[model samples]
Target: SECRYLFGGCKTTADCCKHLGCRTDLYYCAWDGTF
Candidate 1:
């Protein structure tokens, strides 16, 4: 399966791609711009 990126939907932190964190507050994926 594909991973989720910034502004994308995600179920857990593990669901997000590298350097991306899953925001449970908004249930969205976000990149910290470090990768």
Candidate 2:
């Protein structure tokens, strides 16, 4: 599936994950892809 929001810019986990999680180690909005 094409994740339209995947690898996109976000402020928080909800910005990209939408209930999922995010990777905070990169220093930017990066989805942890744990959905």
Candidate 3:
């Protein structure tokens, strides 16, 4: 499957890996880009 939201030459979830270093899972819904 392809990600419509993602652009060209980007890695998938498998390739990117849901690891501690990747930090994709450590986000809060209440927290925006600003502090």
Candidate 4:
């Protein structure tokens, strides 16, 4: 799957979800699901 860089210093779900274009509680984005 194609990967894209999201928030690295996300402090809120809105910060992370904005880049992801979806609702999530994750603080950071990952490609291979590794942290």
Candidate 5:
């Protein structure tokens, strides 16, 4: 699995989701099962 960087500077969950392209509440992404 390819690991991506998740910045701690995210202000909200949406910010994180935006970078991840997955739902903010979701702990896992269906595409790769990575949060």
Candidate 6:
């Protein structure tokens, strides 16, 4: 699976990298705890 970086477009957390998470606010990959 290709990992997404910070601010990258994402559909869910699984789309993000190890240290990143999919944000619900804008649906973009982001650092944990930011939203």
Local accuracy by lDDT, each model: 0.74, 0.45, 0.28, 0.42, 0.39, 0.75
lDDT of 6 by residue, 1-35 (tens): 36776778898887787677787778988777454
Q: After superposition, how far is residue 11 of candidate 2 from its true place, in Å?
A: 1.4
What TM-scores do the predictions have? 0.62, 0.30, 0.18, 0.28, 0.26, 0.58
User: Can you tell me which runs of candidate 1 are displaced by over 4 Å?
Assistant: 33-35
For model 5, the stretches where C-alpha displacement exceeds 4 angstroms are 1-4, 18-35
Q: What is the C-alpha lDDT profile of model 2 across 3-25, one tens digit per residue? A: 22445554555454443344566
Write the number of the candidate with greater lDDT, choosing between 3 and 4.
Answer: 4
Deviation (Å) of 29 in candidate 4:
4.5
Candidate 1 Cα deviation (angstroms), residue 22: 0.1
lDDT of 3 by residue, 1-35 (tens): 22222222333344332221212443212212233
For all candidates, the clash counts are: 0, 0, 0, 0, 0, 0
Mind giving the per-residue lDDT tens digits that candidate 5 earns over 1-35? Answer: 23233433433444434335333455333333344
lDDT per residue (tens digit) for residues 1-35 in model 1: 26776778787888887677787797877887453
Which runs of model 4 end up more than 4 angstroms from their true locations? 1-7, 18-35
Scanning candidate 2 in windows of ten residues, the lowest lDDT window is 1-10
Per-residue lDDT of 8 in model 4: 59
Candidate 2 clashes between residue pairs 3 or more apart in a chain or in different chains: none
Clashes of 4: 0
11: Cα error in model 4, Å: 0.4
Please give the ranking of all candidate structures by TM-score, highest first, separated by commas: 1, 6, 2, 4, 5, 3
